[PDB]
Amino acid sequence: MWSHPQFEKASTGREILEKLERREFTREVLKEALSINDRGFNEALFKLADEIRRKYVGDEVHIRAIIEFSNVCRKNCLYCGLRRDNKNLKRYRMTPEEIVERARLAVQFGAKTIVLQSGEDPYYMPDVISDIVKEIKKMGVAVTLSLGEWPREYYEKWKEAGADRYLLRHETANPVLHRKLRPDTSFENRLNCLLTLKELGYETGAGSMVGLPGQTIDDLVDDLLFLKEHDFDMVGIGPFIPHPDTPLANEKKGDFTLTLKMVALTRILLPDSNIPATTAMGTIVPGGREITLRCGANVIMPNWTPSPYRQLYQLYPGKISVFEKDTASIPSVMKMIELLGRKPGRDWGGRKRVFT
Numbered sequence: 001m002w003s004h005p006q007f008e009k010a011s012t013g014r015e016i017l018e019k020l021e022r023r024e025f026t027r028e029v030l031k032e033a034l035s036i037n038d039r040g041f042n043e044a045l046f047k048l049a050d051e052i053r054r055k056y057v058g059d060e061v062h063i064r065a066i067i068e069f070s071n072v073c074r075k076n077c078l079y080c081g082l083r084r085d086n087k088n089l090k091r092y093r094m095t096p097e098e099i100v101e102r103a104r105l106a107v108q109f110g111a112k113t114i115v116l117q118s119g120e121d122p123y124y125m126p127d128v129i130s131d132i133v134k135e136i137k138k139m140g141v142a143v144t145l146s147l148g149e150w151p152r153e154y155y156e157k158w159k160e161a162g163a164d165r166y167l168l169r170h171e172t173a174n175p176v177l178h179r180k181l182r183p184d185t186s187f188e189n190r191l192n193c194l195l196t197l198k199e200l201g202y203e204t205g206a207g208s209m210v211g212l213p214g215q216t217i218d219d220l221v222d223d224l225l226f227l228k229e230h231d232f233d234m235v236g237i238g239p240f241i242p243h244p245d246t247p248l249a250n251e252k253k254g255d256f257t258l259t260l261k262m263v264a265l266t267r268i269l270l271p272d273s274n275i276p277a278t279t280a281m282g283t284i285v286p287g288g289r290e291i292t293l294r295c296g297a298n299v300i301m302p303n304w305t306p307s308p309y310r311q312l313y314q315l316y317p318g319k320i321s322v323f324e325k326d327t328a329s330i331p332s333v334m335k336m337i338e339l340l341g342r343k344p345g346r347d348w349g350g351r352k353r354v355f356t
């Protein structure tokens, strides 16, 4: 028997970068990219992702204004502050008039997509959502829904009402962990919803949380390969942020750098996808969204939920700032985009097929 020494780190990193540039996306390559803790490797990975972003989605940063119109949820996900067992949290629902008029104001401020997100709140489902969507589509903008898991019939009604996109983050592709963290449902259900949305012709968004309890680097690799397999139009990635009024209150927070590497690898794997710099990235690090927009992201989703509701959509701590008026976010993100040397989107920013 003979020795078995490891290879030097910088050269291994350079070999990983070469494999990523040649698009040799083996599990071992993705695992090693996620595992290397060298600032200079990571910077090269971010620059690769940024290059691919420049080439295949360009310099426009698309603005998607989010209205979080109800924090009522029938589910009990272990990570989420809106879980039904959290009795500390004041619940609210916006009327259709409040929602439509608030959407009109975002359109006037220049948002070209309105995102309607909520807890899984049966009050609205399906017909109130259809009515709201029809009204917002008259404003000349795209509509994205992010309402959770519903029957195919509901998704079909909302498509006929005019919805363009659906964001249903897959959370984790590990089916054992998924069920542990989402005890009402399953990864199979979540995937069936994503497949139905695609079949109905939505632009479909998935994406995971990074740093969930029990999640490993091998699970993150499976998330990347899941995203690649389905060629999602949008991918929403952010860190898990523990919420004090949930069973996961005392667990580790997701790591910003690891999450940024997931965004970068997602852009490399899916060159023409729409990738937000998520709210959670801005919560975890000051300037986190700006950094993420330099590491492969091309979308920003300012929070347009009005007072007094905004502060109650408490998915995780620190999500909401109440230091400025509730109309500040769209101008703010426009200034951010200008300071980055980017441009706001000129059209609805739908996913295009320009890579291969």
Ligand SMILES: Nc1ncnc2c1ncn2[C@@H]1O[C@H](CSCC[C@H](N)C(=O)O)[C@@H](O)[C@H]1O
Binding pocket: 079, 080, 081, 117, 118, 119, 120, 146, 147, 148, 149, 167, 168, 169, 171, 208, 209, 238, 239, 240, 241, 242, 243, 280, 315, 316
């Ligand atoms: N503690 C937490 N940390 C980070 N993101 C969280 C979080 N709790 C929830 N989220 C994220 O918030 C997203 C929107 S939840 C609202 C939409 C819908 N009920 C749905 O579940 O799809 C979830 O997809 C999840 O990725």
Ligand code: SF4
Binding pocket: 073, 074, 075, 076, 077, 080, 081, 082, 083, 084, 118, 119, 120, 148
């Ligand atoms: S993640 Fe979505 S489904 Fe789960 S508790 Fe939160 S709002 Fe409800």
Ligand SMILES: [C-]#N
Binding pocket: 236, 276, 277, 278, 279, 280, 300, 301
């Ligand atoms: C979400 N941004």
Ligand SMILES: [Cl-]
Binding pocket: 064, 113, 115, 144, 165, 234
């Ligand atoms: Cl969108």
Ligand SMILES: [Fe+2]
Binding pocket: 236, 278, 279, 301
């Ligand atoms: Fe988001």
